[PDB]
Amino acid sequence: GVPGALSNQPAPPNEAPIATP
Amino acid sequence: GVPGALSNQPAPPNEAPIATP
Amino acid sequence: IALNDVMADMQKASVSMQMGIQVRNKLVAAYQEVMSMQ
Amino acid sequence: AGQLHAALDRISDRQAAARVQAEKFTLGEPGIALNDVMADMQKASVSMQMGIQVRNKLVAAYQEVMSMQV
Amino acid sequence: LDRLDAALRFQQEALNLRAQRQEILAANIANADTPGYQARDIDFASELKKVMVRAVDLLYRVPDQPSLDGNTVDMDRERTQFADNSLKYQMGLTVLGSQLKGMMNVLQG
Amino acid sequence: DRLDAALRFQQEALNLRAQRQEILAANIANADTPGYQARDIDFASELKKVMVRAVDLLYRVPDQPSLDGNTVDMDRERTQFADNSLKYQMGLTVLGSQLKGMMNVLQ
Amino acid sequence: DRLDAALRFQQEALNLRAQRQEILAANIANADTPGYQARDIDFASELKKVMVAVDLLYRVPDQPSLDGNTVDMDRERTQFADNSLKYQMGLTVLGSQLKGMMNVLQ
Amino acid sequence: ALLNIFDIAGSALAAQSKRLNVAASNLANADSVTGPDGQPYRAKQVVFQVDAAATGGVKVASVIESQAPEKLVYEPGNPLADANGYVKMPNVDVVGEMVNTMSASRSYQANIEVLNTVKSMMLKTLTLG
Amino acid sequence: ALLNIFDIAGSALAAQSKRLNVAASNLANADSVTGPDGQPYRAKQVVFQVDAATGGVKVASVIESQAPEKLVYEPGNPLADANGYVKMPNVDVVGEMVNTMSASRSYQANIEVLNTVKSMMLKTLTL
Amino acid sequence: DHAIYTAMGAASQTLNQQAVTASNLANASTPGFRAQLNALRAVPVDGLSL
């Protein structure tokens, strides 16, 4: 969906890892 | 015409070339 | 319960009371006129 | 028809409790966070406004019903 | 269940929907710093239609931009929606009041 | 028709003020985008046309060039916005006065 | 009567806050005079006694000074700010109560 | 009923006030050492939870000590020095505390504005008639 | 009407917030020569668009800058190529400094416009 | 609104790097000491939008 709109599914969690395995 | 007035035609794009070809 | 709901209920009660009072007054005035006239 | 009596007693108790809490806070002893007192004051004011509006509405209705002409 | 009831109910339920949406907006703006929070809002048109035909299902707003803490509330957009909903509620209240006053004025003389 | 037309003149003036306000707000919010041309509507001519009647907006002449191609000037737009807001409030006051007088006549 | 009793506590709190403000202003203005002792009042006890002139007592010195003065600027400033804010709150409460009492007459 | 907004905003104000108080205490005791009974001071943080009773306001579950590494200063010339002559210093980040303070202030102001708006709307509803 | 003003101003506020966030991120990462996957950090910029007449603004996408990547010489780092050059981010500083101020000023102008229109609508409500 | 968090994180990491440099400079005369290299590292947050 476009930003600021409505949606029926929650957004996935944000991770922001230091370094990928 | 005088700046700030209203005219029907649009404005040509502004070009500022570094060196004349 | 909701404040808007209670305000709307008060308005409904007032309007219904006005309607009933006006109808009763009109009817009793008509009856009184009928009684007064021979 | 004592329900109006009960309601007015309850709102008076609410606003009196708010006043008591305000006095306790102004006494200079730590039990209040300066937010609960203000929230209670606002709620008491709103409840009192609702009560006076109810009184006005009820007295207007009584005036209308007494103004009948049989 | 006839006349006055429905004629004013169409606006009373609209006011109720505006109030509930306002409460949800207040909740999600007060919870704007808790990590991992999801913005909550409802589709007013569909909700009003479903209520009129005769519990409200709340949808999740798509995040504008990500954050590490997991919160997805957008402060400026939430404030704009809050102001818009407040103005709409006032408009509904005033149109309802004007309509009711017009109805009451008939019961004179 | 009588009351309808007498109120309709001011109603159309107010609606035109609202649409011009919308255009001004749009071109103020979009004041920092390259390739945009400032737009406006000739209020007097448009109102005259509507009074005897989907608006024909036209471009605004630039005053000093910018490389990115933006022609909206913030100071001029702000002055126009303030003028339009004052005109809108004036029209609102006039319409309200006319309606209040019409209502008071019936009393 | 009843009207005076409904507002006596708030009015007395306002008055005592004003007096304590004056005391703080005096003992912050005398910050350079040697031999001058800091002064202040016990607000809670004063308010309770008045609701049931003005008693004032010396402040416990913070650090010694050769001249003899015993006033601490940061402490006085914090007390000043606290008393000012509490005075403002008392004024707001009194104003709201009076506004409600006025509104009840319509 | 639009009245529960007062409860929600009051809970939010209480939570923000507690967070601000904790941050201010951390800033004040950033340089403090050797707390009462000898245990060094440890930086404290709050935890926000939703007071569901669906959706609702924010309350503070408890206060928890941060598990960031605890700083050490080499000063044998001090009775608190350990076997290696290290005095323990709390793990307080001044920038983090200041940012927390600013964010708490902004959220508190936003919530009080929400309260005022809801108060105005409810007064309008009262004066609907 | 005036309801579209709220949409327009909200879109403008969102776009300005995105621009400000991008500028702040570039300033923060202005001197971070690495990435989680080993690729060097590269400056990013948003692209504006008009969302259909006239209307508000929208952010179509965030794209990497095509300016040449500044590179320095040090063989110590394993990230160095065959010639010992590593790639510092090619992010200007004064550009971001002025972008922050411009974004903040536009944000303030848009919110002032929104507040003015809200006041006008409230005054219209009591016609 | 959350750019403040990125800026404060950058400031805190700058302070950490300054502490590392100060540590390297302080023990500049101990025999057989190896310096402590340092370089800022970027971590991008992402998902579902912009």
Coordinates of C-alpha atoms in Angstrom, one line a residue, chain H:
Chain H
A1 CA -18.6 8.3 25.2
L2 CA -15.6 10.4 24.5
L3 CA -15.0 10.6 28.2
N4 CA -12.4 7.8 28.3
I5 CA -10.0 10.0 26.4
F6 CA -9.5 11.8 29.7
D7 CA -8.4 8.6 31.4
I8 CA -6.2 7.7 28.4
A9 CA -4.5 11.1 28.4
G10 CA -4.1 11.1 32.1
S11 CA -2.3 7.7 31.9
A12 CA -0.1 9.1 29.1
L13 CA 0.8 12.2 31.2
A14 CA 1.7 10.0 34.2
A15 CA 3.9 7.8 32.1
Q16 CA 5.7 10.7 30.4
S17 CA 6.2 12.4 33.8
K18 CA 7.7 9.3 35.3
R19 CA 10.0 8.9 32.3
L20 CA 11.1 12.5 32.6
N21 CA 11.7 12.1 36.3
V22 CA 13.9 9.0 35.7
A23 CA 15.9 10.7 33.0
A24 CA 16.4 13.8 35.2
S25 CA 17.6 11.6 38.1
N26 CA 20.0 9.8 35.8
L27 CA 21.4 13.1 34.6
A28 CA 21.8 14.4 38.1
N29 CA 23.5 11.2 39.4
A30 CA 25.6 10.7 36.3
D31 CA 28.8 11.5 38.2
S32 CA 27.6 10.1 41.5
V33 CA 29.3 7.0 43.0
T34 CA 29.1 4.9 46.2
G35 CA 25.4 4.9 46.8
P36 CA 24.0 4.0 50.1
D37 CA 25.4 0.8 51.7
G38 CA 28.3 1.0 49.2
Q39 CA 26.6 -0.3 46.0
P40 CA 27.4 2.0 43.1
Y41 CA 24.5 3.8 41.4
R42 CA 23.1 2.1 38.3
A43 CA 21.3 3.8 35.4
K44 CA 17.6 3.1 35.5
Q45 CA 15.0 3.0 32.6
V46 CA 11.3 2.6 32.5
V47 CA 9.1 0.2 30.5
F48 CA 5.8 1.3 28.8
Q49 CA 2.9 -1.2 28.5
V50 CA -0.6 -0.8 27.1
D51 CA -3.3 -0.8 29.8
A52 CA -5.7 -2.9 27.8
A53 CA -9.1 -3.2 29.5
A54 CA -8.4 -3.9 22.7
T55 CA -6.6 -0.5 22.8
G56 CA -5.9 2.0 25.5
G57 CA -3.4 4.2 27.2
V58 CA 0.2 3.6 28.4
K59 CA 1.2 2.7 31.9
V60 CA 4.6 2.0 33.4
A61 CA 5.1 -1.7 34.4
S62 CA 8.3 -1.1 36.5
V63 CA 11.8 0.3 36.5
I64 CA 14.7 -1.8 35.4
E65 CA 18.5 -1.2 35.6
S66 CA 20.2 -0.9 32.3
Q67 CA 22.6 -3.8 31.5
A68 CA 25.1 -1.6 29.6
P69 CA 28.7 -2.2 30.8
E70 CA 29.6 -0.4 34.0
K71 CA 32.5 2.1 33.7
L72 CA 35.7 1.9 35.7
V73 CA 38.2 4.6 36.7
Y74 CA 41.7 3.7 37.9
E75 CA 42.1 5.5 41.2
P76 CA 43.9 3.5 43.9
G77 CA 44.0 6.6 46.1
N78 CA 40.4 6.0 47.2
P79 CA 38.9 3.8 49.8
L80 CA 36.3 2.5 47.3
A81 CA 39.0 1.1 45.0
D82 CA 38.7 -2.6 44.4
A83 CA 41.5 -5.2 44.3
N84 CA 42.8 -3.6 41.1
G85 CA 42.3 0.0 42.2
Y86 CA 39.1 0.6 40.1
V87 CA 36.2 2.7 41.2
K88 CA 32.9 1.9 39.6
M89 CA 31.2 4.6 37.6
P90 CA 27.6 4.4 36.4
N91 CA 26.8 3.8 32.7
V92 CA 24.9 7.0 31.9
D93 CA 24.8 8.5 28.4
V94 CA 24.2 12.2 28.6
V95 CA 23.1 12.5 25.0
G96 CA 20.6 9.7 25.4
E97 CA 19.2 11.2 28.6
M98 CA 18.8 14.7 27.0
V99 CA 17.0 13.2 24.0
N100 CA 14.7 11.3 26.3
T101 CA 14.0 14.5 28.2
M102 CA 13.2 16.4 25.0
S103 CA 11.0 13.6 23.6
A104 CA 9.1 13.3 26.9
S105 CA 8.5 17.1 27.0
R106 CA 7.1 17.1 23.5
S107 CA 4.8 14.1 24.1
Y108 CA 3.6 15.7 27.3
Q109 CA 2.7 18.9 25.5
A110 CA 1.0 16.9 22.7
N111 CA -1.1 15.0 25.2
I112 CA -2.2 18.1 27.1
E113 CA -3.2 19.7 23.8
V114 CA -5.3 16.5 23.0
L115 CA -6.9 16.9 26.4
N116 CA -7.8 20.6 25.7
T117 CA -9.3 19.7 22.3
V118 CA -11.4 16.9 23.8
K119 CA -12.6 19.3 26.5
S120 CA -13.6 21.8 23.9
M121 CA -15.5 19.2 21.9
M122 CA -17.3 17.9 24.9
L123 CA -18.3 21.4 26.0
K124 CA -19.7 21.9 22.5
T125 CA -21.7 18.7 22.8
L126 CA -23.0 20.0 26.1
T127 CA -24.1 23.3 24.4
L128 CA -25.5 21.5 21.4
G129 CA -29.1 22.6 22.4

